[PDB]
Write a protein that binds this ligand. Structure first.
Ligand SMILES: O=C(N[C@@H](Cc1ccc(F)cc1)C(=O)N1CCC(O)CC1)c1cc2cc(Cl)ccc2[nH]1
Ligand SMILES: *Cc1c(COP(=O)(O)O)cnc(C)c1O
Length: 830
């Protein structure tokens, strides 16, 4: 059937009886009233049963061996479905496929029933999920720490071509993969005031919120390791949230509990954009405060909570603990670690600070200013008064270091300050993270250089040893074996299975680039993937597409910097050239654009409407026929990404040079047989450097040309004046050619493009359509298109998150990865 494992005689029988055990005892149902959702839950429990033994022994193992622990703090974990991924890393896929077949069920139909764990917005959240998978596969004692939102990223709906947002009640029917640990509840404080008494400060008169943890197992790939993702949930204390007496009403007091619990209620839907709301900051401190007490409690047990030098010596703290900050969201970990170490444990400032800097590391994910976290001082002052004092003291000592290092440079002083003066004073969280971490990294070579050369130049001059690079990566398990079993099979038929946990081996596929059988195969799985997606489109969304055309797809969050608009202009150009010469031959294309817009992002929502508007005209022009279809992919999420990517021919990564830190969708496409048309931005540079530029479709300005244009001054009118085809499009948008009933509907987009285009869309237009003509020419030659594809796939090995994690571990955390199988799952009950 494929190498989804073995379908052993005894195991398929065992799986079947356990499926039935659960349908009966767990779901309280009988085959006569069980719905597909019941069957999915019976399977979920049956599979989940296989990792409880491993989970207990892994955790038990880390306790006995006591290695250095890695803690990944992120306010986002974009996990997706988890049934298939668990079967994959456990080698249960074929067994479970057989077992359900015999029970008369379709396993694929059942997997579609599982809800996505959408606790993330996009790139940042998915990276943490991939990292988790890699850290388990590499045998690292790691824990993911975050928040358990009952409502994740909103479900996107298209109404009249407009995006509509609807609550993501993903827990509605239950989450079989989480394990509530009520017995580990912790208290988090808010507000209050600071009292300075004899032997130290005291944070007093605080409001308490309880933090209840829910653990989700994270299984390593076929190595019997199961790590833990701990997500906190807000719970109201039953005392004060009722006990603070003297009228108000008893009923009201109970109802008002949903005020303390609103903290873990919903995820903020912003991607690469900062919104300074109090509720956000509360979530940020909530995850930080609970996680730290948990980390310190675990440390106090270790082997110190037995003997060792005897005396709670936090000197060894950094030898046993490493906490990674995914962006600046969990940045309050720095001042909170100081609060505990100094205010509670009573360490002297300097020892506390040495410890903090040595255990904390920070990862930067973007350079656009509107994404930077600058919290108003009055907010931190009301909510976390003690933390504000600590930040001031950290700032004081840091600026003293600066003044010493660069005497008289008064401007460098104000530029480097953690406290920004002006309208309202604010705290620059990124500056805080640099000062309190022993390492700061970019997510791609180009982005990391931009950090040192631009944004954090002053810091790089002060402490150069701190800045590193860690190019992102994706996990080959979910992004190859799970979503593209076909391509994974034909690759394994030739080079083995060892590449699944050592992607570098894909390079061996290079020697099959001239193999007639392989070329036919690689091409065959892509055709099968395209046919299946084409089917899915009519099944769940309904309105046909031609599977023989080139599948042009750009899927990611909708942003001005990602330039979905530039893709739009190319689509209109194609349409116009067809209408001009109808009986001329052109390579058929199905351009698919998908992604969610943040609810408050007006321009982004206007772009979605443009895209659907364009498809309304194009898809109904009889002269166009089936040569050009413009389709907007609804509700783009992880599970949907697993469907499109394997079916794509052209991956669109056209952000303005210097704006996309790294990108990860680009890597997903490269590994699944799509060719890439993009700019020299983020990881794109390293990808084309790995495949060779001849095997990539690069175009547009490079970082340097963008800066040259900025010195000169960007004027859109020039491009509009010199390019007739461009002018025609803009006049088509202005006159209402795409919005008849509302002729001025897109005046906002045209205005922006012409007068305030921060991402110089027009500047890259000519080179973009010229380059698109080249891919169309290569597509016309199936054999040569496929061979280039093989060059990309065979050369994507470097973008596996296992490589990224091995680097973080070795160069930042100080731990050695290991591909050693943990001692079987075998029963055991001590
Ligand atoms: O959720 C699990 N078990 C139940 C077992 C259970 C069921 C009912 C009950 F009243 C108490 C415990 C549970 O502890 N919670 C159920 C929901 C409740 O609100 C909190 C506790 C669970 C077991 C398990 C094993 C693995 Cl390997 C992974 C995830 C898991 N979740
Ligand atoms: C990988 C992924 C992303 C990131 O895409 P980019 O093109 O790097 O911005 C976002 N959302 C989902 C659903 C993903 O799978």
């Amino acid at each position: 059937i494929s190498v989804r494992g073995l379908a052993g005689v005894e195991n398929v029988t065992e799986l079947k009886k356990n499926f039935n055990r659960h349908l009966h005892f767990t779901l309280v149902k009988d085959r006569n009233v069980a719905t597909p959702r019941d069957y999915y839950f019976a399977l979920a429990h049956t599979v989940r049963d296989h990792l409880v033994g491993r989970w207990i022994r892994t955790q038990q193992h880390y306790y006995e061996k006591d290695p250095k622990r890695i803690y990944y703090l992120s306010l986002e974990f974009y996990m997706g479905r988890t049934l298939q991924n668990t079967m994959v890393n456990l080698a249960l896929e074929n067994a479970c496929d057989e077992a359900t077949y015999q029970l008369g069920l379709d396993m694929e139909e059942l997997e579609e029933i599982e809800e996505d764990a959408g606790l993330g917005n996009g790139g940042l959240g998915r990276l943490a999920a991939c990292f988790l998978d890699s850290m388990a596969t590499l045998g690292l004692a790691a824990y993911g720490y975050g928040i358990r939102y009952e409502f994740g990223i909103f479900n996107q709906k298209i109404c009249g071509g407009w995006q509509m947002e609807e609550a993501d009640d993903w827990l509605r029917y239950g989450n079989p993969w989480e394990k509530a640990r009520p017995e580990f509840t912790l208290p988090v404080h808010f507000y209050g005031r600071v009292e300075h008494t004899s032997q130290g400060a005291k944070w007093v008169d605080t409001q308490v919120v309880l933090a209840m943890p829910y653990d989700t197992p994270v299984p390593g790939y076929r190595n019997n390791v199961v790590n833990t993702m701990r997500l906190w949930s807000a719970k109201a204390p039953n005392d004060f949230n009722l006990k603070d007496f003297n009228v108000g009403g008893y009923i009201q007091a109970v109802l008002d509990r949903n005020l303390a619990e609103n903290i873990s209620r919903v995820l903020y839907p912003n991607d690469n954009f900062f919104e300074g709301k109090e509720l956000r900051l509360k979530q940020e401190y909530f995850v930080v405060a609970a996680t730290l007490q948990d980390i310190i409690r675990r440390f106090k047990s270790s082997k110190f909570g037995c003997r060792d030098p005897v005396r709670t010596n936090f000197d060894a703290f950094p030898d046993k603990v490493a906490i990674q900050l995914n962006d600046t969201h969990p940045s309050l970990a720095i001042p909170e670690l100081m609060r505990v170490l100094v205010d509670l444990e009573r360490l002297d400032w300097d020892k506390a600070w040495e410890v903090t800097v040595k255990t904390c590391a920070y990862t930067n994910h973007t350079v656009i200013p509107e994404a930077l976290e600058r919290w108003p001082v009055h907010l931190l002052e009301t909510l976390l008064p003690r933390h504000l004092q600590i930040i001031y003291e950290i700032n004081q000592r840091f600026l003293n270091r600066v003044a010493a290092a660069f005497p008289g440079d008064v401007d460098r002083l104000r530029r480097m300050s953690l406290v920004e003066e002006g309208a309202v004073k604010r705290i620059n969280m990124a500056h805080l993270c640099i000062a309190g971490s022993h390492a700061v990294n970019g997510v791609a070579r180009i982005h990391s250089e931009i950090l040192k050369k631009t944004i954090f130049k002053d810091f790089y001059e002060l402490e150069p040893h701190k800045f590193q690079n860690k190019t992102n990566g994706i996990t080959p398990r979910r992004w190859l074996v799970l979503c593209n079993p076909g391509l994974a099979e034909i690759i394994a038929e030739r080079i083995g299975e060892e590449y699944i946990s050592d992607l570098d081996q894909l390079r061996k596929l290079l020697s099959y680039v001239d193999d007639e059988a392989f070329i036919r195969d690689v091409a065959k799985v892509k055709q099968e993937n395209k046919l299946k997606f084409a089917a899915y489109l009519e099944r769940e969304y309904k309105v046909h597409i031609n599977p023989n055309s080139l599948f042009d797809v750009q899927v990611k969050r909708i942003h001005e910097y990602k330039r979905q608009l530039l893709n739009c202009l190319h689509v209109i150009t194609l349409y116009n050239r067809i209408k001009k010469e109808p009986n001329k031959f052109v390579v058929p294309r199905t351009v698919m654009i998908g992604g969610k817009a943040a609810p408050g992002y007006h321009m982004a929502k206007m772009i979605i409407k443009l895209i659907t508007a364009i498809g309304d005209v194009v898809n109904h022009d009889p002269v166009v026929g089936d040569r050009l279809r413009v389709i907007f992919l609804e509700n783009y999420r992880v599970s949907l990404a697993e469907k499109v990517i394997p079916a794509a021919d052209l991956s669109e990564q056209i952000s303005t040079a210097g704006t996309e830190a790294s990108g990860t969708g680009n890597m997903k496409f490269m590994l699944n047989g799509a060719l890439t048309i993009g700019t020299m931005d983020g990881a794109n540079v390293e990808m084309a450097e790995e495949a060779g530029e001849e095997n990539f479709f690069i175009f547009g300005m490079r970082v340097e040309d963008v800066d040259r244009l900025d010195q000169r001054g960007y004027n859109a009118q020039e491009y509009y004046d010199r390019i007739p085809e461009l002018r025609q499009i803009i006049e088509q948008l202005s006159s209402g050619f795409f919005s008849p009933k509302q002729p001025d509907l897109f005046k906002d987009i045209v205005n922006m493009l012409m007068h305030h285009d921060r991402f110089k869309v027009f500047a890259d237009y000519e080179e973009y359509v010229k380059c698109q003509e080249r891919v169309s020419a290569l597509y016309k030659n199936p054999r040569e298109w496929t061979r280039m594809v093989i060059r990309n796939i065979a050369t994507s090995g470097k973008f596996s998150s296992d490589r990224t994690i091995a680097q973080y571990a070795r160069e930042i955390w100080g731990v050695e990865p290991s591909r050693q199988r943990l001692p079987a799952p075998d029963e055991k009950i001590p």
